[PDB]
Design a protein around this ligand. Structure first.
Ligand SMILES: Cc1ncc(COP(=O)(O)O)c(CN)c1O
Lengths: 425, 433
């Protein structure tokens, strides 16, 4: 499929066929594909100061405004913002600064990072190691040393026979505590988690998961990294997924949804607990020895500022919340369809996991074929979704309206009826 | 209180900055650009003799790039799928390569590019059934970026201290800086021979079957504009070829006209298997980087950003149309000559450079090759005075670097070097009083 242009929630292929972009590109195009104010902000800044760097006591207006804006928006008190080009780079720099911080606190052994199976955190050698998906690892010799993985909080696929949802949450927290104790709690620097796992199949954690996990982390004074790369800026029904799930991160990572993917930019926020010992170490060394050439890029920063202004001016967090409520309801009305194993989601993100045998939770051979078959029909019916194995993901732009949600979910129902009628046989 | 400087102090953690000092002093805030000049928020204008971060090749006020960006952003601001600017740019870069290349890959940064190259090499050795051929040899004072892997490739102590780097599998051989590394009575070519011998000794000691690749900048930028001795690259390549080790040319700084040719690989007769680009690829007007691989690399293993790609394509077209490689070559010849007229200054230990990149290393005792206590104080002192005289350089320790935009003219080169000469006289006078 060759995509040539976009407009609102739609993209068009070279033949002129229009599709609802049900994943907003890479779960990132928040304001849709034709927001003219973002091009206006880019063109204005690029003709004033197209590039300057933030190295060595230099700065510029756009990054200063954006740093203030992001800190002011934080769901918990934050101290500083640091800028990169991608979410992958951000998580990579976060791991590096966590090691630096532990050295700056006289803890040379507190260097291990706990991630989760099916988590997604980027593609650098380090951030691909954090990533808990199989295709990211073995043939790349990953994960690197110091990165650990605990279990995926996906009740439908990980719960034991007869186990309740909250018992499953308790078991995950206990398995996390068991991991920390067996590794040596003083060796664990941080735990990283998406509020909801996006690329791993839209895994919504069981209720009480984040409360119980945070109790464990607080017991050992382990840092919490909230990876808001997908869940940020209105996706889950609040500005940040951390608010939706009552998470209190020390570090909060944001991706190019900062700019609705219109330009490469990413950032993370750190609280005073993280910043202060890093600042003192940088003073003993004489510099903080890291940074990307385009960190804080003024044109990307200008576009991000305008993108955030649009989200606030047009109340897009509330719009996503309310369209999300309607989408979640419409999708769950398909629960009784013969091919629907599970419907999961919160706010404006959802997954529909397909099966052909509901009791055994199995689909076609191999797993992935059913999702690939349904996704092809869905595309033909004018909706672009992402098949994550046998899960179809829905993550449309924040500007969508109820009429468009209705069209998207009706296309999915018709798709499932088509696939059902064709499987026999 | 709500000034730009105060808000930066309050909210913004800077790269490559002492955070405690930033809180006390605040940043210098840049407002706008114009050709080779930038202007700070107080209205003072400076020659950007570093092109920002050795990157703004077409200067700071090229409105054609803004129109290219806006045009794509108004058509398709983002997609992951890929005619079109990403396809067009990949084709253009392969066609421009100084040696035959097969495929182009895109990232946002040079750091991500080098990180991905390392990952691809490990994947490739596994596909070849060589699980041990995973080590990468880099060089002391080389600079290759700041991801955990590419900061490990980097050979500068500030990039490693307290970061627990380099990771395993990354080795560093010697820096090819004759002025700082040559032994008593060793000639430049003998030093090159010794460096190739030390490289071969490292390869043998590690087990040649465990070495996957060697990475080098043609000229080391961030490490202090280190020009390798004559015959270095020929002798190094002979060693690498003997053990079937891949050559990665990191052209992030040298690419697109900086060294007097399109690529530093041409200037130094390097025949890389992998070539890494960034910076002047787009003149930094938007973040984008790329690496090329040849068929040898691609055979066993057989989503750039469309707005950034469109800007890079138009940037390359400008460089082509306005003959900026030739302009930089001819302005470079003049700059190299003017800078070397200062070699006899009492504060100048060495002038080095090729094309439009140069470094001037400062000392107070020319025979001992020592400066002030500590090393770096003399460079910081002179760089501050040069900025007072309206020229932005970069102090790499006690080396002042010059890497001006490809659009500079001879009159501007003359102004820049005259500011350095007067700076060195001022600093010398201050030291003796
Ligand atoms: C030679 C070289 N390689 C790689 C990099 C890393 O590029 P980036 O800052 O875009 O990550 C740099 C940037 N200073 C460089 O000079």
């Amino acid at each position: 499929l060759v995509i040539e242009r976009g407009d609102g929630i739609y993209v068009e292929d070279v033949s002129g066929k229009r599709y609802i972009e049900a994943m907003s590109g890479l779960l990132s195009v928040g304001v849709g594909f034709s927001e003219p104010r973002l091009a206006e902000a880019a063109a204005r800044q690029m003709k004033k100061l197209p590039f300057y760097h933030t190295f060595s006591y230099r700065s510029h207006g756009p990054v200063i405004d954006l740093a203030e804006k992001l800190v002011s928006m934080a769901p918990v008190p934050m101290s500083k913002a640091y800028f990169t080009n991608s979410g992958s780079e951000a998580n990579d720099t976060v791991v590096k600064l966590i090691w630096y911080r532990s050295n700056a606190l006289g803890e040379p052994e507190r260097k291990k990072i706990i991630s989760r199976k099916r988590g997604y955190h980027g593609v650098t050698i380090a951030s691909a190691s954090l990533t808990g998906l199989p295709n990211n690892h073995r043939s790349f010799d990953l994960p690197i040393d110091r990165i650990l993985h605990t279990g995926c909080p996906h009740f439908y696929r990980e719960g034991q026979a007869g186990e309740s949802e909250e018992q499953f949450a308790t078991r995950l927290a206990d398995e996390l505590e068991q991991l920390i104790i067996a590794e040596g709690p003083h060796t664990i620097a941080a735990f990283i988690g998406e509020p909801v796992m996006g690329a791993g199949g839209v895994v919504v954690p069981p209720k009480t998961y984040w409360e119980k996990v945070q109790a464990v982390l607080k017991r050992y004074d382990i840092l919490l990294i909230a990876d808001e790369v997908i869940c940020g800026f209105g996706r889950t029904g609040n500005l940040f997924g951390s608010q939706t799930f009552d998470m209190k991160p020390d570090i909060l990572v944001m991706s190019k949804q900062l700019s609705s993917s219109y330009l490469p930019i990413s950032a993370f926020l750190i609280n005073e607990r993280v910043y202060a010992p890093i600042a003192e170490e940088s003073h003993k060394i004489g510099t903080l020895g890291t940074g990307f050439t385009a960190s804080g890029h003024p044109v990307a920063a200008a576009v991000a500022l305008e993108n955030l202004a649009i989200i606030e001016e047009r109340d897009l967090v509330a719009n996503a919340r309310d369209r999300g409520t309607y989408m979640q309801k419409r999708l769950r009305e398909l629960q009784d369809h013969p091919l629907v194993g599970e419907v999961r989601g919160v706010g404006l993100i959802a997954g529909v996991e397909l099966v052909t045998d509901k009791q055994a939770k199995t689909g076609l051979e191999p797993t992935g074929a059913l999702g690939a078959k349904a996704n092809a029909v869905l595309q033909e019916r004018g909706v672009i979704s992402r098949a994550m194995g046998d899960t179809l993901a829905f993550c449309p732009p924040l500007i969508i309206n109820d009429q468009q949600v209705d069209t998207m979910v009706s296309a999915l129902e018709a798709t499932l009826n088509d696939v059902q009628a064709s499987l026999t046989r």
